[PDB]
């Protein structure tokens, strides 16, 4: 929606959710050079 | 998408597939913002050019999809559009600077673990992620290759380029509304979106609320996958405060 | 090469 999306937004029911990774997603945070 | 793998099941719960009702096909992508608004390419709307202008009973939007040609049956849930609103300065004739449109759903969806919206980035998000070396990952069911379609949902991470690398790569020209990412042939990597693949979502994941944000929206490209060329894409964030105005203006 | 969509959505 406006103000950076949503309510739930971007927790996805499936990883974030349940506290799992995608096979990737690793990827993703290894190059900010790295995640939380 | 080229030299991608396939998504697992749930990985991108805020893709949509664009789909023509007749004849019975796939459009582009689209990503969706809240139960009642999806976000795409303007060009997946109107390209009079190629006297290309789809009206809002011309579509339906499909989400929770997998399958590209499969009807998923209990998992999908398929919309009918109420409006289309395409940037009143989308250039479709010189370089398609404002490729973005806002599609408002006839009824709002309900969330499921297919079905999830993804977060518009704000200035200090926008800011710490859209970084030259940065990657992003693109998403779609488009040709897989520049010149077959996948059965599924397929994957790619690119990282984001250096405004000057992208200039530098076409002849077109480059307004701030855009970026370009791929990888240099330095780097021995590779993917791009691809036909079919406009309209999609190109989304970052914060390290800070570990939440999915959408960066780009798939907007052009010399070629798939070519060697010394990048995709390039709306410039989402240079363009939520129009995104902010409709959906004050009349949205949900 | 699509599988059919239900009527209720055409
Ligand atoms: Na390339």
Same mark, same amino acid.
């Given at each position: ?10 927790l ?5 959710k ?13 190059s ?5 | 998408?080229?030299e ?8 991108? !719960?805020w893709?949509?597939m ?6 019975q096909e796939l459009?582009?992508?689209a ?9 795409t ?8 050019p190629? *006297?290309?202008?789809?009206?809002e009973? *011309? ?13 998923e ?5 398929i ?9 009143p300065?989308?250039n479709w ?14 009824? !709002?969806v309900?969330?499921? *673990?297919?079905?999830? !919206?993804?977060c ?5 998000t926008?800011?710490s ?15 897989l ?22 200039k ?8 701030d509304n ?10 021995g ?7 079919? *693949?406009?309209?999609g ?5 914060? !390290? ?7 960066m780009?929206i ?14 390039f894409?709306?410039?989402?964030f ?15 | ?10």
């Amino acid at each position: 929606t406006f103000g950076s999306g949503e309510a739930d937004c971007g927790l996805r029911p499936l990883f974030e959710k349940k506290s799992l990774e995608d096979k990737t997603e690793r990827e993703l945070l290894e190059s900010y050079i790295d995640g939380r | 998408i080229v030299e991608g793998s396939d998504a697992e099941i749930g990985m991108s !719960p805020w893709q949509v597939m664009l789909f023509r009702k007749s004849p019975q096909e796939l459009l582009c992508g689209a990503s969706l913002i809240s139960d009642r608004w999806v976000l795409t390419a303007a060009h997946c709307l109107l390209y009079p050019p190629w *006297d290309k202008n789809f009206t809002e009973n *011309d579509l339906l939007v499909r989400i929770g999809k997998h399958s590209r040609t499969r009807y998923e049956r209990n998992i999908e849930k398929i919309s009918m559009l109420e409006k289309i609103y395409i940037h009143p300065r989308y250039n479709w004739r010189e370089n398609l600077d404002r490729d973005i449109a806002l599609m408002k759903l006839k009824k !709002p969806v309900a969330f499921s *673990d297919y079905i999830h !919206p993804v977060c518009l980035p704000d200035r200090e998000t926008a800011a710490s992620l859209l970084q030259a070396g940065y990657k992003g990952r693109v998403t779609g069911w488009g040709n897989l290759k520049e010149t077959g379609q996948p059965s599924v949902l397929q994957v790619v991470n690119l990282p984001i380029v250096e405004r000057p690398v992208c200039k530098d790569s076409t002849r077109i020209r480059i307004t701030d509304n855009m970026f370009c990412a791929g990888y240099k042939p330095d780097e021995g990597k590779r993917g791009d979106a691809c036909e079919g *693949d406009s309209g999609g979502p190109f989304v970052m994941k914060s !390290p800070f609320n570990n939440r999915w944000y959408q960066m780009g929206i798939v907007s052009w490209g010399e070629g798939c996958d070519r060697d010394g060329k990048y995709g390039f894409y709306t410039h989402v964030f240079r363009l939520k405060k129009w995104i902010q105005k409709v959906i004050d203006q009349f949205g949900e | 090469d699509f599988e059919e969509i239900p009527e209720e959505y055409l």
